[PDB]
A paper describes a structure:
Glutathione S-transferases are a family of detoxifying enzymes that catalyze the conjugation of reduced glutathione (GSH) with different xenobiotic compounds using either Ser, Tyr, or Cys as a primary catalytic residue. We identified a novel GST in the genome of the shrimp pathogen [name] FIM- S1708+, a bacterial strain associated with Acute Hepatopancreatic Necrosis Disease ([name])/Early Mortality Syndrome ([name]) in cultured shrimp. This new GST class was named [name].
The crystal of [name] had a monoclinic unit cell with space group P1211, and the diffraction data of [name]-GTS were scaled and refined at a resolution of 1.92 Å. [name] consists of two monomers per asymmetric unit. The GSH-binding domain (residues 1–81) is called the G-site, while the hydrophobic substrates are bound at the H-site (residues 82–204). The RMSD between the two monomers in the asymmetric unit was 0.36 Å, with only minor differences in the N-terminal domain’s loops and β-sheet 2. [name] crystallized only in the absence of ligands. Although [name] is an apo structure, a crystallographic water molecule coordinated by the potential nucleophiles Thr 9 and Ser11 was observed. The double mutant lacked detectable activity, which led us to conclude that water was the general base catalyst.
Residue numbers in the entry:
A (entry chain B): 1 to 115, 128 to 212
B (entry chain A): 1 to 115, 121 to 212
The structure:
Amino acid sequence: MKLYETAMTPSCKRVSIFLKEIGGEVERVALNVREGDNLSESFKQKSVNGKVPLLELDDGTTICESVAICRYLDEAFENDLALFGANQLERAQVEMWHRVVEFQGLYAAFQAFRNAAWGEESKSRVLEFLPTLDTRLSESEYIATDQFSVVDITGYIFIGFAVNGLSIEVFEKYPNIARWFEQVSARDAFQSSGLEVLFQ
Amino acid sequence: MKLYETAMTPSCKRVSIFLKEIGGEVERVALNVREGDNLSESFKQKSVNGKVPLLELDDGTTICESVAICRYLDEAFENDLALFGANQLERAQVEMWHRVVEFQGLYAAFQAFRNQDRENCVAAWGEESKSRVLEFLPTLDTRLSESEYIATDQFSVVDITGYIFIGFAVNGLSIEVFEKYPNIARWFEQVSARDAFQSSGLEVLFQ
């Protein structure tokens, strides 16, 4: 299999960090950037959502969506990190908190970043979610469960959006997010994630 | 366990259809509708997202988000439907197509139905959201010309979500989907005939 990606974009970094966490290695194929994760006119039919990252299997089957690629790669490389949840309850809690972080945090941050009235509304929803996330991190070491999971990769990208893309002073105002972020950003798999340049 | 729900709302019907498919039974607790779409009352802190449906386990743990509730129930009631996918590839394709249908279809249909755009008011965002629904429908129709179901060749949770999405488009947004997209129509005729979808309230779900 091979992973099609652009050089420095949040969607692709979600998969890159996941792969480093589980100790997997997948051949990369670099693509040109189009506009909004987009693929070229001649390359877009390979991707159902029309975007990178794109995982291509040996017979030509392609999987798009960063989380879908991560799920496939989780089963491709034996590992003990259980990033989608170690037991039945954790698997449901991971699903719950992943969708909460994605809808209330990541997607709103994306909308606010690329944008004026909807971008401002999207930014307000980000600001309203941060106290909810901070309160959660005051009573749980990680977002979804007591252990590091894929939700923490997604949350890290979301907070990276908020601080480095939207100029929100998250860490000044929310010490529990800051505690968790300091912890997660120290993990080996997050090094050279491009955080400092990812949201320029 | 207990499932907290309101009487006739799409998010709760997503769980109800799934539970019927896998042959599970869970005690239901009716709640009042609080508008704001699916929002809970002053008891909302038991729900991380503040909405119904809400699953409460025997030990008091609560799980919100319809798909997360379905994932737990799938393991709680052993079944051979493999609604999340039967093997590694199917599980990834389910995840891929579920997210495509949810973002590009269902979520946009919700926003158009309930309606905040680039230098605009709330009405223009609803019109923009409706245009996104219309742009995704050809992609779904082309998929259903090559696959019997949305995510794979087998019925999966994505087809439950697609059914709710197309219900939104036709019965909520007055889009003549079936006239223009015969493969969606074929698939919808097939899925809407399943026993678990009977009495889903389709005719009244989007009033």
